[PDB]
Design a protein around this ligand. Structure first.
Ligand code: FAD
Length: 295
């Protein structure tokens, strides 16, 4: 039921860019684009939680073809327009430092993707991934811990759960459980999909909770910048009590390093009832209830 590797690097699907919109509002840090591709002309099917590969043009410094980079799929299986003809991605442009040869280095595939024009053809492989899939259980609780572009798999879940058009299109999945997104970003204009997430929380105040950790605008109790691990420690007892429910699934997505502060918070909460979190967590992974994709 999970499509995997319908297209591979040796014979990719050639899709076309339909649109390339900016997500970072003025006053925000960096460039993050929402890119939609046209899938008509092939048979790329995918579901929520998966990723595709993009093969950028050109050669590296040794003269070899650039290889694929993976990107979380940011649309549901139906695409943003709910017509089963497109796929979307949420791509941050990577750029960095001086002590790494020269001046500013720009990431190859991410610079290529964030500046790509409508009508352009893109080499697409996949889909791949079975680690971030959503259960078809409409009464599941879903905890979502995202930073930056890790919002991408979370958006596919929430849209499937809460978009009017999705609910009419998926008669077998009418979500009636509870979901909680904790979303860590640097500024308020860096809240990707802010307007759509907050509209969801207004229509479903009992089925969706939205918490932000905004580091240039909020301080944690210790006077430092507010990061997602600070918000998780604030609500550690609550999150622990939801995680004990047999129905609860936890998703963690974002840049590497966020995992250690989430564990230390849930560790202190579990200990209060004589549970060693690192052992409870192994059982959760085994059961398919603890989902992690960091990079
Ligand atoms: C499963 C998965 C899902 C992903 N999903 C997404 C997504 O939804 N959105 C998204 O934007 N990205 C996503 N990424 C990351 C993405 O695949 C690419 O790694 C990223 O876009 C950068 O690729 P590039 O081609 O731009 O950079 P490259 O040109 O390959 O540059 C990256 C290389 O430069 C170096 N480098 C990077 N950062 C620094 C730094 N701060 N200091 C020093 N050196 C550094 C490292 O050697 C790194 O290998 C995902 C990755 C994985 C594995």
């Amino acid at each position: 039921d999970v499509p995997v590797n319908l297209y591979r690097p040796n014979a990719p699907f050639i899709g076309k860019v339909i649109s390339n919109e900016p997500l970072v509002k003025e006053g925000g840090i960096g460039i993050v684009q929402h890119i939609k591709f046209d899938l008509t002309g092939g048979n790329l099917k995918y579901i929520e939680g998966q990723s595709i590969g993009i093969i950028p043009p050109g050669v590296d410094k040794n003269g070899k073809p650039e290889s694929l980079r993976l990107y979380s799929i940011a649309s549901t299986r139906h695409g943003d327009d709910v017509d089963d003809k497109t796929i979307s991605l949420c791509v941050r442009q990577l750029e960095y430092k001086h002590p790494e040869s020269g001046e500013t280095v720009y990431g190859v595939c991410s610079t290529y993707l964030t500046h790509i024009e409508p009508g352009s053809e893109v080499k697409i492989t996949g889909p791949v991934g079975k680690e971030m899939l959503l259960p078809d259980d409409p009464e599941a609780n879903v905890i979502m811990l995202a930073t930056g572009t890790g919002i991408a798999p979370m958006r596919t879940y929430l849209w499937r759960m809460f978009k009017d058009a999705e609910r009419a299109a998926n008669p077998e999945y009418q979500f009636k459980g509870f979901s909680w997104l904790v979303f860590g970003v640097p500024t308020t204009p860096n809240i990707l999909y802010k307007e759509e997430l907050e509209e969801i929380q207004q229509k479903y105040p009992d089925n969706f909770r939205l918490t932000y950790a905004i580091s240039r605008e909020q301080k944690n109790p210790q006077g430092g910048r507010m990061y997602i691990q600070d918000r998780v420690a604030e609500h550690a007892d609550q999150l622990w009590q939801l995680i004990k429910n047999q129905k609860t699934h936890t998703y963690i997505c974002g840049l590497r390093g966020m995992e250690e502060g989430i564990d230390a918070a849930l560790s202190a909460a579990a200990a209060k009832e004589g549970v060693t979190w690192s052992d409870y967590q192994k059982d959760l992974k085994k059961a398919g209830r603890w989902h992690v994709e960091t990079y």
